[PDB]
Structure 1
């Protein structure tokens, strides 16, 4: 029943992990946008197929997009930060079971004015990073991945992979990339939801 034991070990068992070809940090194939605790959020999944703990793990993200300044300066692929908790320190994660990374689309978010329709014709790329030190090694690892606009499933949630069994927990990685539609999901941008109230 306890996820973590008094000595540090975790009562978790992983099934459907696949060949050792994986056994490393992994990102969900798709990204999603949906309501969470009353706010429109951009979310994606991260998992450690390996068997060791990832020390001082922390996540980052950036929206890549070319732009022109008022000065007329052209910038190839400006890198705009996507807030995933740095300010409060919740960008730092304890990864044992797959975690869902959440980005609140607030007034400061670069996606603040994007609706489902906008995302359809959008032309940007979101780069996601996971970094940390693999247990028993002196090397800090940097796992990367990316989500194009058309790779973001609006109105979807991730299928649970953590199941509570008898005095123990099991993680089913065959559900890692799985998502499901949530019709009730608002279709307007986060900004419209802010004014709507």
Structure 2
């Protein structure tokens, strides 16, 4: 029985091939555990208070008729479950469940071609060798979030190996084109 973490804490991972492996180049939207999800991958420069946060940047007009040049809307990535405090040894695909509280609630494969936004990702977590306070950030514009895609796995096992050549790799999978909001609407009247 090959364990991932030793009783004394040492991780049994083998990493195998510039900060190009910190964040995946694209993010995707697809189904996982019955939910449409915004996903992107996180690695390392290769977890002391390692926390992740995501914001949606976009222009929008409020119902009051006010135009907001660049408004920030939160993107729940675990803050409500502690899942945002990452145990970050091997690559992790961060998941944002699209629900009625999400800024992507009414985003559909069709609306994506019209919408213009920017998902900013911020990772903070004191370093391993100095415990120093560092922050890495990334961004995903509208054209960098792939609807109907899924990430290829990077972990396998006589070592627990990470294949970083597939870090940024995704592929298409049958996915409804509807937005979660349209889905709740359909099911309600297609029931």
TM over 0.5: yes
C-alpha distance in structure 1 between counterparts of 2:26 and 2:63, whole Å: 34
After TM superposition, where is structure 1 displaced by more than 3 Å over at least 4 residues in a row? 70-74
Q: Deviations over 1:91-114 (max 9, x none)?
A: 111011100000000001111011
Structure 1 Cα separation of the partners of residues 29 and 136 of structure 2: 22
For 2:170, the equivalent position in structure 1 comes to 179
In 2 relative to 1, CA 193–74 (structure 1 residues): closer, same or farther, beyond 3 Å? closer
Separation in structure 1 between the aligned mates of residue 64 and residue 99 of structure 2, nearest angstrom = 27
CA distance in 1, matches of 2:131, 2:40: 28
1:159-174 equivalence runs, <5 A? 159-164=152-157, 166=158, 168-174=159-165
What does residue 31 of structure 1 align with? 27
Partner of 2:62: 69
Q: Which residue number corresponds to residue 179 of structure 2? A: 189
1:49, 1:97 → 2: CA distance? 11
Which residue of 1 is the match for residue 14 of structure 2? 13
Q: Is the 8 A contact 2:48 2:131 kept in 1?
A: no
| 3-state SS in 2 of match to 1:174 | helix
* Partner of residue 82 from structure 1, selected from 75, 85, 94: 75
Root-mean-square deviation (CA), in Å?
A: 1.4
Structure 1: which 5+ runs fail to align?
none
1:48, distance to aligned residue in structure 2 (A): 1.1
For normalisation by structure 2, the TM-score amounts to 0.92
1:45 to 2:38 alignment: no
TM-score by length of 1: 0.89
8 Å CA contact 1:25, 1:143 repeated in 2 = no
* Equivalent residues in 2 for 1:60-139, closer than 5 Å: 60-139=53-132
Higher strand fraction: Structure 1 or Structure 2?
A: 1
Give the unaligned 5+ runs of structure 2.
Answer: none
